[PDB]
Amino acid sequence: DIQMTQSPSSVSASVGDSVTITCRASQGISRWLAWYQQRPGKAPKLLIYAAGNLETGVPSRFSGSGSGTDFTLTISDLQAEDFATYYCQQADSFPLTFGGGTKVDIKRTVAAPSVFIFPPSDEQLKSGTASVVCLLNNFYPREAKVQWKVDNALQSGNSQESVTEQDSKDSTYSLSSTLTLSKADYEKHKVYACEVTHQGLSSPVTKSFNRG
Amino acid sequence: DIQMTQSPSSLSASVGDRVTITCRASQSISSYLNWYQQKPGKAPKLLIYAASSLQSGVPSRFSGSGSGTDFTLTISSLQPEDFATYYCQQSYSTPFTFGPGTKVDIKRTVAAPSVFIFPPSDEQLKSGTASVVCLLNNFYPREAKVQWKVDNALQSGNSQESVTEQDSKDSTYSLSSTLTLSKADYEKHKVYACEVTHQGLSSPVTKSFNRG
Amino acid sequence: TNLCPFGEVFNATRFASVYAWNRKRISNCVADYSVLYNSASFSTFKCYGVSPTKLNDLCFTNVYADSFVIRGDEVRQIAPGQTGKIADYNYKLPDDFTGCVIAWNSNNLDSKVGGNYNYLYRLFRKSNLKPFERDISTEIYQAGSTPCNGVEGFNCYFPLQSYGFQPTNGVGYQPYRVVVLSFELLHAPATVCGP
Amino acid sequence: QVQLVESGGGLVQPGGSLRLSCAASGFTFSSYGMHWVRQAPGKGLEWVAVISYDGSDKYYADSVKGRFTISRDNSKNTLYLQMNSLRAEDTAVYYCARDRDRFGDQGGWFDPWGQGTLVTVSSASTKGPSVFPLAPSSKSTSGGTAALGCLVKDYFPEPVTVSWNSGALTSGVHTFPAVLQSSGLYSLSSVVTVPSSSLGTQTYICNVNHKPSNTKVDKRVEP
Amino acid sequence: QVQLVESGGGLVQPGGSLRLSCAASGFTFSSYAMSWVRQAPGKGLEWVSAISGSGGSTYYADSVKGRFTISRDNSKNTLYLQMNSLRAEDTAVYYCAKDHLITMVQPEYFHHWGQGTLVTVSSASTKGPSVFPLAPSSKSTSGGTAALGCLVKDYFPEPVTVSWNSGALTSGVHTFPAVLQSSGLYSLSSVVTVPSSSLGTQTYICNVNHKPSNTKVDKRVEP
Ligand SMILES: *[C@@H]1O[C@H](CO)[C@@H](O)[C@H](O)[C@H]1NC(C)=O
């Protein structure tokens, strides 16, 4: 009833740039809003309360503004320790609600993804399950949009995704998609492939293999 | 002003039953609601205070529960001394407003009323005003409709009706409706009729008479 | 040239309840009261003992700033020789008060759709409060003759009650932020002059 | 024991004045705030005014603002309500109630209530009633239960006591409540159901007694 | 300034019960309202429940109401959350939050946070992982660099550790975060990139350590 919407879902910035994040509420909440920052594997930390009030230990480069429905958080001089996830929470009506969350990433040159494919080994075939692996290595940005083709047929609801954090050396990503199916279902088909559509690629890249 | 609404307006229950009454406010009042009981001809009594808190001397069959804009009053076991009128009051701000009131009456089977009509006496036709009386006897429940017709002309405004309190021996009601008009307006027509509708008969039943 | 920190008192984000009124001590600075007196944003601005009309040329030992929140109809109680809930049980001013009282509407901040129940006031006490006395106890009040034994029930009430602050309430039931400035004058250097 | 007693009701012409008092006994009067409530005939409860323990905070309803005044005396243990510019819709029963605190602004309940006092505002003068007969059916039996009664009309003030055959007939007698007509005068009806075969033999007489006009009518109803 | 420590989190079956405790030190415990806020393993924050500096008022969300019960003990300076009828959607890290200012009835903000306790809801038993090879390639033509790997499957509970030659080959090693399958167990993949020249010459293996099941397993990778 009091759902709050954040924007954008994810942004990229370099050290020294400025970032603006918007938070909107379904109904007027006066100035009952708080901005929180969280790093992976750690407890959330408060940055702003009221609408633009600074916390006693937060660096003075965080700013907040807005009232009623719109609110805005501003990072002026971005540093290396300001890459985290930010949340906006209302505190006027019950139940209390949190924002979706916005992730701030490191900006760098566009990199293409090296695509590899991995068939299921003989050892696992004895067990009765098969997992075909599509590996996307060293790309940017985060949007991958990997799809699975079996005999040129779209597959849905059969694969799961896993991504890494930004590399500490070259600020790149990596992705692995696993198509898991039964041993009996694996012998039904003969051709498998995974296709990748990325900003750094002029055309979608398909990696395929045949049984045996 | 805060408007308070009770549901329902009249409830018929028998001895040993469970009775629930609902009060609703137009604005949050926290736990500032009270429940009062009043019997005919006597001062109102205090039953519940502060949402849920019994009053000394009140039997433990009464209970209350609620917070915000929704409250409920509950009687677990009904007793012959519990048929009365119940009010909900808000103690949030001035002016203090009560509810319309819910009336509890003893339950019994339905009864079809007997309808009688009385033309105006010769001692009243020689006084400038004529009164025609319609009498309903021995009906349950209270809800009944009475319509006055003169040559199939529906009229409203020149009629008042009264009902008695519920009887003790048989718990039935009696109703009387009077139609009053002037001497000159009484002899402009020929037939008069009183048509009554109650949920104890097949179809509306009317009693009519012609002048002279 | 040190400016007196009136911004932290008037422009504070969150205020204190009337029974837990906040006290701040101000000394060794320069105050420009004409800025406050010419703001055209305060509903109530009444000063006793001193004349508000450009009397900042006086030196005072200390300035005590007391902050709290009440409802509109209770603003009349913040004055010498007053009786009521706030004057008797929450905040009492002496009859020989020498200071200033400022109160302004805060329905846009302290109100809360659904009810702001975090502002409380004390309703029951064994005796009236002495001037400038603060009570923050939560002992159960004994209304009748049966001891409470530390539990609430018949004739046993929690001594604190909650304001219900909503944007749709009347002016008499809307939040008002109150700041009281008390000027101390003793045998001291009196470093608070504020030219 | 704790109790409250009201006094000061009666009849007042429109635009007049009145003053009701409520005396309390049993508890300490100076430690509680007091309320006035009212109930119109056949209507619901309506809150009127509230006074604190020392008369420094008074609040009234929107319909009684300016006209009404609340007051209290702590030495006499009394609560006073004064009504100026009395209107025709101020006719009601009045109750004095006591709160659980000294102020009574919010969060309270009316624990003790008084008996209540009646205040009527009307321009009508004292007038006796006129009784009329209601012939049962005049339609040659065709039945076995016949209803007959009297019609008390145009009397002021209430009440009138209707009895049948000097109290001999009590079974089947219904006396409806009086209604206030557009002329300021009351009117009620009393009915009785009797066997039809007794219509020609037994004589039926309705006795209407109006006290504050010294009136006694003994009209009879016959076919 | 203050210190909040949470305890009681663990592994329970669906439909079971749990009691989480939050111990607070450094302030007057009865003057502040406590809150329980949970975070899913890969999702955002969600406010769960709140108490009010006493116990009179309790606030619950629209997804835990009817199953959760919040309480506190001010004498022992402790806060309790009783969770019943637990489902798989309740697997989250729980935080005991509190505001800096004195709030007695309503939570408002969350300035102080605890360490958090992970609460896992599953019907699976401890089971050792299974390791399989992912062959590097069959063509050293694209760029002279191939990618090989190992796959860990069907283990519970978390975590597993892969070292890739006992911490001697850490160059291009990419261990992916584990994911929860549709059966209750987990999966993991560790892939490395090496020059295609050292395919039939160099030797690398994957060693997997899982402490809860006490399983250390070595596996060879070969084209
Ligand atoms: C409070 O803030 C307003 C606007 O920022 C300002 O005009 C006012 O002077 C401030 N109050 C004081 C006492 O300086």
Short mmCIF file of N, CA and C in Angstrom, two decimals, chain A residues 56-151:
data_model
loop_
_atom_site.label_atom_id
_atom_site.label_comp_id
_atom_site.label_asym_id
_atom_site.label_seq_id
_atom_site.Cartn_x
_atom_site.Cartn_y
_atom_site.Cartn_z
N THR A 56 26.65 11.27 12.12
CA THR A 56 27.82 11.86 12.76
C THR A 56 29.14 11.38 12.17
N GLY A 57 29.18 10.18 11.60
CA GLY A 57 30.43 9.65 11.09
C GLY A 57 30.50 9.54 9.58
N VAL A 58 29.37 9.75 8.91
CA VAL A 58 29.32 9.63 7.45
C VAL A 58 30.12 10.76 6.82
N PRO A 59 30.91 10.50 5.78
CA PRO A 59 31.63 11.59 5.11
C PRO A 59 30.68 12.62 4.53
N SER A 60 31.13 13.87 4.53
CA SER A 60 30.31 15.01 4.11
C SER A 60 30.04 15.05 2.62
N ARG A 61 30.42 14.05 1.83
CA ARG A 61 30.14 14.05 0.40
C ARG A 61 28.82 13.38 0.06
N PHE A 62 28.05 12.95 1.06
CA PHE A 62 26.73 12.38 0.86
C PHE A 62 25.68 13.46 1.13
N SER A 63 24.75 13.64 0.20
CA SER A 63 23.72 14.66 0.34
C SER A 63 22.35 14.06 0.09
N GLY A 64 21.34 14.62 0.74
CA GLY A 64 19.98 14.17 0.56
C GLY A 64 19.04 15.35 0.43
N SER A 65 18.02 15.17 -0.41
CA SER A 65 17.04 16.23 -0.65
C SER A 65 15.72 15.60 -1.03
N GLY A 66 14.68 16.42 -1.08
CA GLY A 66 13.36 15.99 -1.47
C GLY A 66 12.37 16.05 -0.32
N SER A 67 11.11 15.81 -0.66
CA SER A 67 10.03 15.89 0.31
C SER A 67 8.73 15.42 -0.33
N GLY A 68 7.87 14.84 0.50
CA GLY A 68 6.54 14.44 0.07
C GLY A 68 6.50 13.11 -0.66
N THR A 69 6.89 13.12 -1.93
CA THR A 69 6.92 11.91 -2.75
C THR A 69 8.31 11.62 -3.29
N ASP A 70 8.98 12.63 -3.85
CA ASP A 70 10.30 12.44 -4.43
C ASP A 70 11.39 12.67 -3.39
N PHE A 71 12.46 11.87 -3.49
CA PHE A 71 13.65 12.05 -2.68
C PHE A 71 14.87 11.69 -3.52
N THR A 72 16.00 12.32 -3.21
CA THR A 72 17.21 12.18 -4.01
C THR A 72 18.43 12.10 -3.10
N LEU A 73 19.30 11.13 -3.39
CA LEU A 73 20.58 10.97 -2.72
C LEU A 73 21.70 11.24 -3.71
N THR A 74 22.72 11.98 -3.27
CA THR A 74 23.78 12.47 -4.16
C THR A 74 25.14 12.14 -3.56
N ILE A 75 25.98 11.49 -4.37
CA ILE A 75 27.39 11.27 -4.03
C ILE A 75 28.23 12.18 -4.91
N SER A 76 28.93 13.12 -4.29
CA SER A 76 29.65 14.16 -5.03
C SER A 76 31.03 13.70 -5.48
N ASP A 77 31.91 13.38 -4.53
CA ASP A 77 33.27 12.96 -4.87
C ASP A 77 33.43 11.47 -4.61
N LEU A 78 33.11 10.65 -5.61
CA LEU A 78 33.09 9.21 -5.42
C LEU A 78 34.49 8.67 -5.15
N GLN A 79 34.59 7.80 -4.15
CA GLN A 79 35.85 7.17 -3.76
C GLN A 79 35.77 5.66 -4.00
N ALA A 80 36.86 4.97 -3.68
CA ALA A 80 36.94 3.53 -3.92
C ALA A 80 36.15 2.71 -2.91
N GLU A 81 35.77 3.30 -1.77
CA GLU A 81 35.01 2.60 -0.74
C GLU A 81 33.53 2.94 -0.79
N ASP A 82 33.08 3.59 -1.86
CA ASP A 82 31.68 3.99 -2.01
C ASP A 82 30.94 3.14 -3.02
N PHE A 83 31.42 1.93 -3.29
CA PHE A 83 30.75 0.99 -4.18
C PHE A 83 30.00 -0.02 -3.32
N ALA A 84 28.69 0.15 -3.21
CA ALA A 84 27.87 -0.68 -2.34
C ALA A 84 26.43 -0.62 -2.84
N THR A 85 25.49 -1.09 -2.03
CA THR A 85 24.07 -1.05 -2.35
C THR A 85 23.36 -0.11 -1.39
N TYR A 86 22.46 0.71 -1.92
CA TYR A 86 21.80 1.77 -1.16
C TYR A 86 20.30 1.53 -1.12
N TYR A 87 19.70 1.73 0.05
CA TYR A 87 18.28 1.49 0.27
C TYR A 87 17.62 2.73 0.86
N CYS A 88 16.36 2.97 0.47
CA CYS A 88 15.54 4.02 1.06
C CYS A 88 14.36 3.39 1.79
N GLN A 89 14.17 3.77 3.05
CA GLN A 89 13.11 3.21 3.89
C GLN A 89 12.21 4.33 4.39
N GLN A 90 10.90 4.09 4.36
CA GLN A 90 9.92 4.99 4.95
C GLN A 90 9.64 4.60 6.40
N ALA A 91 9.30 5.60 7.21
CA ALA A 91 9.03 5.39 8.63
C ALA A 91 7.82 6.19 9.08
N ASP A 92 6.75 6.18 8.29
CA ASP A 92 5.54 6.92 8.67
C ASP A 92 4.31 6.05 8.80
N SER A 93 4.21 4.96 8.05
CA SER A 93 3.05 4.09 8.10
C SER A 93 3.48 2.66 8.35
N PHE A 94 2.61 1.90 9.02
CA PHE A 94 2.93 0.51 9.27
C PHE A 94 2.15 -0.39 8.32
N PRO A 95 2.76 -1.46 7.80
CA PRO A 95 4.13 -1.90 8.07
C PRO A 95 5.20 -1.07 7.37
N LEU A 96 6.37 -0.95 7.99
CA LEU A 96 7.47 -0.23 7.38
C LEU A 96 8.00 -0.97 6.16
N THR A 97 8.42 -0.21 5.15
CA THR A 97 8.82 -0.77 3.87
C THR A 97 10.20 -0.25 3.49
N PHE A 98 10.93 -1.07 2.74
CA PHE A 98 12.26 -0.76 2.26
C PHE A 98 12.25 -0.60 0.74
N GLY A 99 13.26 0.08 0.23
CA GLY A 99 13.40 0.24 -1.20
C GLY A 99 13.99 -0.99 -1.87
N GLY A 100 13.92 -1.00 -3.20
CA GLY A 100 14.45 -2.13 -3.95
C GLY A 100 15.95 -2.27 -3.83
N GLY A 101 16.68 -1.16 -3.94
CA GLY A 101 18.12 -1.19 -3.86
C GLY A 101 18.81 -0.80 -5.15
N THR A 102 19.88 -0.03 -5.05
CA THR A 102 20.65 0.41 -6.20
C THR A 102 22.12 0.09 -5.98
N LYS A 103 22.76 -0.48 -7.00
CA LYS A 103 24.14 -0.92 -6.92
C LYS A 103 25.01 0.01 -7.74
N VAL A 104 26.12 0.46 -7.16
CA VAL A 104 27.06 1.36 -7.82
C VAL A 104 28.30 0.56 -8.17
N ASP A 105 28.66 0.56 -9.45
CA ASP A 105 29.74 -0.26 -9.98
C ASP A 105 30.85 0.62 -10.55
N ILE A 106 31.99 -0.01 -10.81
CA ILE A 106 33.13 0.68 -11.41
C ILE A 106 32.93 0.74 -12.91
N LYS A 107 33.21 1.90 -13.50
CA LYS A 107 33.06 2.09 -14.94
C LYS A 107 34.40 1.90 -15.63
N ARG A 108 34.39 1.16 -16.74
CA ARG A 108 35.59 0.91 -17.51
C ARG A 108 35.19 0.66 -18.96
N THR A 109 36.19 0.42 -19.80
CA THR A 109 35.94 0.20 -21.22
C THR A 109 35.15 -1.08 -21.44
N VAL A 110 34.36 -1.09 -22.52
CA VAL A 110 33.55 -2.26 -22.83
C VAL A 110 34.45 -3.41 -23.25
N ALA A 111 34.21 -4.58 -22.66
CA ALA A 111 34.99 -5.78 -22.95
C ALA A 111 34.05 -6.88 -23.42
N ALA A 112 34.48 -7.60 -24.43
CA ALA A 112 33.72 -8.70 -24.98
C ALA A 112 33.85 -9.94 -24.09
N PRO A 113 32.83 -10.80 -24.07
CA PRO A 113 32.91 -12.03 -23.31
C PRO A 113 33.43 -13.28 -24.02
N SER A 114 34.51 -13.86 -23.49
CA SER A 114 35.01 -15.11 -24.04
C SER A 114 34.06 -16.24 -23.65
N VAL A 115 33.51 -16.93 -24.65
CA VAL A 115 32.48 -17.93 -24.43
C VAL A 115 33.08 -19.31 -24.61
N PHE A 116 32.92 -20.15 -23.60
CA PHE A 116 33.34 -21.54 -23.64
C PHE A 116 32.16 -22.43 -23.30
N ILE A 117 32.21 -23.67 -23.77
CA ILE A 117 31.16 -24.65 -23.52
C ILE A 117 31.80 -25.90 -22.92
N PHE A 118 31.05 -26.58 -22.06
CA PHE A 118 31.54 -27.75 -21.35
C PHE A 118 30.47 -28.83 -21.33
N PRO A 119 30.71 -29.95 -22.01
CA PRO A 119 29.75 -31.05 -22.02
C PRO A 119 29.82 -31.83 -20.72
N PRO A 120 28.85 -32.71 -20.45
CA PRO A 120 28.89 -33.48 -19.20
C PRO A 120 29.80 -34.70 -19.31
N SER A 121 30.66 -34.86 -18.31
CA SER A 121 31.68 -35.90 -18.34
C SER A 121 31.05 -37.29 -18.24
N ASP A 122 31.83 -38.30 -18.62
CA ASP A 122 31.36 -39.67 -18.59
C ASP A 122 31.02 -40.12 -17.18
N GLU A 123 31.82 -39.68 -16.21
CA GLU A 123 31.65 -40.08 -14.81
C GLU A 123 30.26 -39.73 -14.29
N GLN A 124 29.82 -38.50 -14.53
CA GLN A 124 28.51 -38.07 -14.06
C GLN A 124 27.37 -38.79 -14.77
N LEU A 125 27.59 -39.23 -16.02
CA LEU A 125 26.54 -39.90 -16.77
C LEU A 125 26.13 -41.21 -16.11
N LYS A 126 27.04 -41.84 -15.36
CA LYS A 126 26.69 -43.04 -14.61
C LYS A 126 25.67 -42.73 -13.52
N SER A 127 25.81 -41.57 -12.88
CA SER A 127 24.91 -41.20 -11.80
C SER A 127 23.48 -41.05 -12.29
N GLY A 128 23.28 -40.41 -13.43
CA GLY A 128 21.96 -40.27 -13.99
C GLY A 128 21.54 -38.84 -14.28
N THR A 129 22.46 -37.90 -14.11
CA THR A 129 22.18 -36.49 -14.35
C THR A 129 23.26 -35.92 -15.26
N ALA A 130 22.91 -34.87 -16.00
CA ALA A 130 23.84 -34.19 -16.88
C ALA A 130 23.70 -32.69 -16.69
N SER A 131 24.83 -31.99 -16.75
CA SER A 131 24.87 -30.54 -16.59
C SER A 131 25.81 -29.97 -17.65
N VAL A 132 25.24 -29.24 -18.61
CA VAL A 132 26.02 -28.57 -19.64
C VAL A 132 26.34 -27.17 -19.17
N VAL A 133 27.60 -26.76 -19.30
CA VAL A 133 28.07 -25.50 -18.74
C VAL A 133 28.41 -24.53 -19.86
N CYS A 134 27.87 -23.31 -19.77
CA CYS A 134 28.27 -22.20 -20.64
C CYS A 134 28.99 -21.17 -19.78
N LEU A 135 30.20 -20.81 -20.18
CA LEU A 135 31.10 -19.99 -19.38
C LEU A 135 31.39 -18.70 -20.14
N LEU A 136 31.04 -17.56 -19.54
CA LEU A 136 31.32 -16.25 -20.10
C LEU A 136 32.40 -15.60 -19.24
N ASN A 137 33.54 -15.29 -19.85
CA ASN A 137 34.72 -14.85 -19.13
C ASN A 137 35.11 -13.43 -19.53
N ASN A 138 35.38 -12.61 -18.51
CA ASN A 138 36.00 -11.30 -18.65
C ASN A 138 35.22 -10.35 -19.55
N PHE A 139 34.03 -9.95 -19.13
CA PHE A 139 33.21 -9.04 -19.91
C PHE A 139 32.78 -7.85 -19.06
N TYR A 140 32.18 -6.87 -19.74
CA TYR A 140 31.62 -5.65 -19.17
C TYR A 140 30.72 -5.00 -20.21
N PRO A 141 29.54 -4.49 -19.83
CA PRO A 141 28.98 -4.44 -18.48
C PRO A 141 28.35 -5.75 -18.01
N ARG A 142 27.49 -5.65 -17.00
CA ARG A 142 26.94 -6.80 -16.30
C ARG A 142 25.88 -7.55 -17.11
N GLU A 143 25.14 -6.86 -17.98
CA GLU A 143 24.04 -7.46 -18.72
C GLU A 143 24.60 -8.50 -19.69
N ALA A 144 24.21 -9.76 -19.49
CA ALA A 144 24.71 -10.88 -20.29
C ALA A 144 23.64 -11.44 -21.23
N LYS A 145 22.48 -11.81 -20.69
CA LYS A 145 21.36 -12.33 -21.47
C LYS A 145 21.77 -13.57 -22.28
N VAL A 146 22.05 -14.64 -21.54
CA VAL A 146 22.44 -15.91 -22.12
C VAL A 146 21.19 -16.76 -22.35
N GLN A 147 21.14 -17.45 -23.49
CA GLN A 147 20.02 -18.31 -23.83
C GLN A 147 20.53 -19.68 -24.26
N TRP A 148 19.70 -20.70 -24.08
CA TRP A 148 20.07 -22.08 -24.35
C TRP A 148 19.26 -22.61 -25.52
N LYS A 149 19.93 -23.28 -26.45
CA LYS A 149 19.30 -23.86 -27.63
C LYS A 149 19.62 -25.34 -27.70
N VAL A 150 18.59 -26.16 -27.82
CA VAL A 150 18.73 -27.60 -28.03
C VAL A 150 17.99 -27.93 -29.31
N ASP A 151 18.73 -28.33 -30.34
CA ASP A 151 18.17 -28.51 -31.69
C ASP A 151 17.46 -27.24 -32.15
#
